[PDB]
Amino acid sequence: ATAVVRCRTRLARRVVAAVGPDGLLPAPCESRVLESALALALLTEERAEADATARLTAYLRTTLRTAPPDPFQCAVARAVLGGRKRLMFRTVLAALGATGFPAVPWEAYDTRPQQSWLHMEMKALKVLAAHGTGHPDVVRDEDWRALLPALEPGPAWECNNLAQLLALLALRHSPRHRPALGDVLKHVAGRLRPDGGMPAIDGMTVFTTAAAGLALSLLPAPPACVTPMADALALRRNPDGGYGFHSGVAQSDVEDTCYVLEFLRRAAPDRHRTAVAEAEGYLLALRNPDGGFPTFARGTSSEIAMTAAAASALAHDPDRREEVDEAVRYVVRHQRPDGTFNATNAVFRAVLALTGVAAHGEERRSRARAAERALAHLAATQNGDGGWGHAEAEPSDPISTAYAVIALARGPRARPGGPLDRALAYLVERQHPDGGYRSRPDQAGPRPLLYDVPALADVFVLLALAHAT
Numbered sequence: 001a002t003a004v005v006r007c008r009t010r011l012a013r014r015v016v017a018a019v020g021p022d023g024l025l026p027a028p029c030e031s032r033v034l035e036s037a038l039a040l041a042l043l044t045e046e047r048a049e050a051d052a053t054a055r056l057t058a059y060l061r062t063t064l065r066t067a068p069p070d071p072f073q074c075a076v077a078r079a080v081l082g083g084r085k086r087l088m089f090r091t092v093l094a095a096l097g098a099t100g101f102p103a104v105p106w107e108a109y110d111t112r113p114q115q116s117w118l119h120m121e122m123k124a125l126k127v128l129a130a131h132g133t134g135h136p137d138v139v140r141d142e143d144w145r146a147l148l149p150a151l152e153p154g155p156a157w158e159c160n161n162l163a164q165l166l167a168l169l170a171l172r173h174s175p176r177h178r179p180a181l182g183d184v185l186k187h188v189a190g191r192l193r194p195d196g197g198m199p200a201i202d203g204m205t206v207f208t209t210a211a212a213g214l215a216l217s218l219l220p221a222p223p224a225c226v227t228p229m230a231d232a233l234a235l236r237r238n239p240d241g242g243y244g245f246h247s248g249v250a251q252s253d254v255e256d257t258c259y260v261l262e263f264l265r266r267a268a269p270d271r272h273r274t275a276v277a278e279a280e281g282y283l284l285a286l287r288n289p290d291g292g293f294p295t296f297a298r299g300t301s302s303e304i305a306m307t308a309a310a311a312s313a314l315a316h317d318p319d320r321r322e323e324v325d326e327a328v329r330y331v332v333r334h335q336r337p338d339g340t341f342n343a344t345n346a347v348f349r350a351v352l353a354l355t356g357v358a359a360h361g362e363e364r365r366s367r368a369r370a371a372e373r374a375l376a377h378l379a380a381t382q383n384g385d386g387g388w389g390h391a392e393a394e395p396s397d398p399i400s401t402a403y404a405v406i407a408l409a410r411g412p413r414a415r416p417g418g419p420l421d422r423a424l425a426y427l428v429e430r431q432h433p434d435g436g437y438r439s440r441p442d443q444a445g446p447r448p449l450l451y452d453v454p455a456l457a458d459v460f461v462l463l464a465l466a467h468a469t
Helices: 003-018 032-044 050-066 071-081 082-097 116-132 140-143 163-169 178-189 203-216 226-234 254-267 273-287 306-312 318-333 344-357 362-381 400-409 418-428 455-468
Strands: none
Touching: 003 203, 003 418, 003 455, 032 050, 032 071, 032 163, 050 071, 050 226, 071 082, 082 116, 082 226, 116 140, 163 178, 203 226, 203 254, 203 318, 226 254, 254 273, 254 306, 273 306, 273 318, 273 362, 306 344, 318 344, 318 362, 318 400, 344 362, 362 400, 400 418, 400 455, 418 455
16 A cells, blocks of 8 residues: 555554553653652662662763753752742752742742652652751641652552652651661662663553544544453552543543543443543543533633543533534634643644534634634644644654644645655654654653653554544
């Protein structure tokens, strides 16, 4: 056939091959400087795990020399080797001796409990700031109580190594929590990767399996493995009907749940009808009065990408027309004067909602105009090699390009030399001999700090090729 179809075929064979007999696509996360530096600080202050501390140290020196991350993580590493976001990051550096502690009232550190990861991280930072400024009396019992999960053995609570490491750095100052510290330090040291670093998270297998299942379910003849992958996802659903990003993550989120719902709707709508209905209920319970959807917790601000993803995922059931149209109207109202709302991810989400949801009359025209401007922004920012980078002046990467391809697949048909044609040729050219893709990562957490789940590059390119072919 075409070079594009041969590319899609080799990639689909690779993604299918990577799915295991348990139905999951493994998605380990690479070591990250921030968590590796915090682990080094913790083990060093506790004079523990000598072999792990030396490997962590060599990992940090190597990584600064050969592949340095963003400037914040570099300063964190050098500290250990030698709005609300600003408060968090400055307190981390101050905890490591790199800057002064923010001169803020202590209430600056208090956060809403349902943002449960951030809540524990900010309690830990409050405790470090209270001790670091010489006011340990400030810490109240409810501050310590929020940190208790960090003293449980096994993998980190919510798969979140940053939250556990910050909590332990705080807890080692408390005489009544120190009996539990020795055992967890053993578990922490046991997490080091082959390169000697600490990963940000245990993995992203739920997110990655769902997105791959969706991509596979969009092929002309989906492979048989979509059924065990649907099964593996549905038996991991949380009590509220939603999905966390990995096994063992109790905090459901909208983005994971939308990928699972979209996949299940295509691959197992009857076999998993109850899981489908429960994920729909999860999303509907989260919807804000303005018609948008938050990332995790209702009452928190609606976000464009989450609003667009939920609109698309809910559009299947005709009983939800009202909710879906309100969400798409929210997307139209929030388009920026340059057609926007990395750069290409939100455009992808918005364009699929703008063109997938059925509409006629004046609303059809309004949505069509919005999608045109978004696809025009993509055409205007396309790089000479046919790809897109994570911002307009950045070199191309396959994942940013994959997102743009999914959106452009909803525009006019590919013409030779046109933007979609050139983007597909870019992806064809970037396929590695083993059939896969290597890419700059685009997942962030805590925003804007990137972490690298390499399995996602193959999956998002496959999703793009499946949409575009």
